[PDB]
């Protein structure tokens, strides 16, 4: 749940799978970011043939190598990082997402097009 | 913040083993010794524990006492003179008493330790 200045993958669009975190994006001193938290980020590793070349974007954080102490107390963690890229209000750059399945990445609930499209094992 | 954690410290962290096993070779030999009282109120957790495995029996006891005394004369004395005599008693074999003179030169009270009949 820790993102002050971190590299994390994209599992999505760009041309390669790196990013820089800049700022967690809720009110005025937020200091951390769990999942379901739109963060403003900077694309850093290159993009062959071009979509998002070297600007900066905003992304929804998916899994995080840290524990969700869930309401009935299981606790799904992974070993990776990622985030899906969001156009200026709430959408996706394509209709394909390739990271890793349900276990309820839905849990901001402003995002349903991700979890309808977060397919299966790899 | 010492808080529910027993077994007090004296010296160092491996000088204490060579304090225990060097005062436990003398009490079993002589029957009685004379120490300072915070060195005496804690030796009876070790010396009383050796004589319990003494009367237990077999070579898995006399091979386990030998890693704490390392003397094949003290163990073959311990397993037949002081080990038979306590086959009526459930623990508590030692006795520590206070003694009415200080140790002039550094002023520490003494104690008299022996194993009971």
């Amino acid at each position: 749940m820790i993102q002050p200045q971190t590299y994390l993958e994209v599992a999505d669009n760009t041309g390669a799978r790196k990013i820089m975190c800049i700022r967690v994006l809720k009110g005025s001193n937020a200091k951390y970011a769990t999942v379901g938290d739109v963060i403003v980020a900077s694309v850093k590793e290159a993009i062959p043939r071009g979509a998002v070349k070297e600007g900066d974007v905003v992304k929804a954080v998916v899994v995080r190598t840290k524990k969700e102490v869930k309401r009935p107390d299981g606790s799904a963690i992974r070993f990776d990082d990622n985030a899906a890229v969001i156009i200026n209000n709430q959408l996706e750059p394509r209709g394909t997402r390739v990271f890793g399945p349900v276990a309820r990445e839905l849990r901001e609930k402003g995002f349903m097009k991700i979890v309808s499209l977060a397919p299966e094992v790899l | 913040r010492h808080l529910k954690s027993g077994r007090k410290l004296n010296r160092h962290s491996s000088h204490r083993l060579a304090l225990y096993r060097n005062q436990a070779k003398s009490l079993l030999t002589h029957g009685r010794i004379t120490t300072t009282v915070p060195k005496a109120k804690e030796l009876r957790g070790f010396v009383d524990h050796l004589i319990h495995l003494a009367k237990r029996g077999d070579l898995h006891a006399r091979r386990l006492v030998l890693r704490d005394l390392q003397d094949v004369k003290l163990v073959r004395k311990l397993f037949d003179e002081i080990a038979p005599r306590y086959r009526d008693r459930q623990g508590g074999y030692t006795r520590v008493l206070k003694l009415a003179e200080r140790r002039r030169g550094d002023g520490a009270p003494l104690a008299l330790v022996e194993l009971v009949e």
């Binding site: - | 008493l97 206070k98 003694l99 009415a100 003179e101 008299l112 022996e114």
Partner: protein, 57 residues
């Protein structure tokens, strides 16, 4: 470097020292004999609590 100033009086030099007075010990008699003793120790003239353990056999 943290050096003092004005030297203290006799009347306040000898007021700290008011609180350093020491206590006499506590003594009871050995019951098998007739003398003093600190009241939880083996007695080094008359011998014991219950059973000798000391004193010149």
């Amino acid at each position: 470097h943290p050096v003092p100033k004005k030297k203290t009086s006799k009347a306040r030099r000898d007021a700290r020292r008011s609180h350093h007075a020491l206590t006499p010990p506590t003594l009871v008699p050995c019951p098998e004999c007739k003398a003093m003793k600190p009241p939880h120790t083996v007695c080094p003239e008359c011998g014991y609590y219950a059973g000798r353990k000391v004193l010149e056999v």
